[PDB]
Amino acid sequence: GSSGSSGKLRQWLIDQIDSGKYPGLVWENEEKSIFRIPWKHAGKQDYNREEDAALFKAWALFKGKFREGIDKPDPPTWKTRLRCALNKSNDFEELVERSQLDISDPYKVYRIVPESGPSSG
Numbered sequence: 001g002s003s004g005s006s007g008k009l010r011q012w013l014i015d016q017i018d019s020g021k022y023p024g025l026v027w028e029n030e031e032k033s034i035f036r037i038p039w040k041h042a043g044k045q046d047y048n049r050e051e052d053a054a055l056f057k058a059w060a061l062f063k064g065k066f067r068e069g070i071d072k073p074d075p076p077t078w079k080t081r082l083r084c085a086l087n088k089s090n091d092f093e094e095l096v097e098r099s100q101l102d103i104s105d106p107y108k109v110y111r112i113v114p115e116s117g118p119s120s121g
Contacts, residue, residue, distance in 0.1 A: 007063050009085050014112070022055045024107055034095065036107045049075060056082055091115070 017025050017035045024038030042052065050057075056078035060066050063081075066073070086092065095109035113119075 004062070009059070009063075009082075009089060010091060010112070012059070012062055016055060016058070024105065025055070028098075028109065034109065034111045036099075036109045038105065038107045039101060040106055053078055059085075086110070 014032065016022060017027055018032055020026065024036065026036060028034040028036060040052075053073075053075050056075070057066075057073075059082045060078050061068075091113045093111035093113045095111050098109045100107060
């Protein structure tokens with residue numbers, strides 16, 4: 001809020017969804033507990049990367065320090081970094097059950113598991 005003293009994904013990410021700045025990223029519910037992330041794969045080079053890494057870029061720049069313009073950017077690092085954290089986060093649940101990657105617009109659903117929440121069930 002005031003200053004990014006302690007960086008983190010749990011909140012950071014949530015902030016991105018609530019803000020609704022990036023497309024696809026929307027809260028399936030009002031409680032802002034469950035959301036959906038757009039999972040696509042172009043591969044092309046001429047295609048626009050900025051957008052593809054619109055959210056990923058922020059993640060890194062936020063957590064670490066990426067030199068924009070001087071240091072050569074690498075989507076792999078960003079995607080891998082986040083993609084990995086998403087799963088690494090034990091406070092996150094896999095809603096793949098509802099996830100739809102076989103439709104017009106593919107996306108992966110996830111549930112933010114709290115601390116005082118029932119691990120099992």
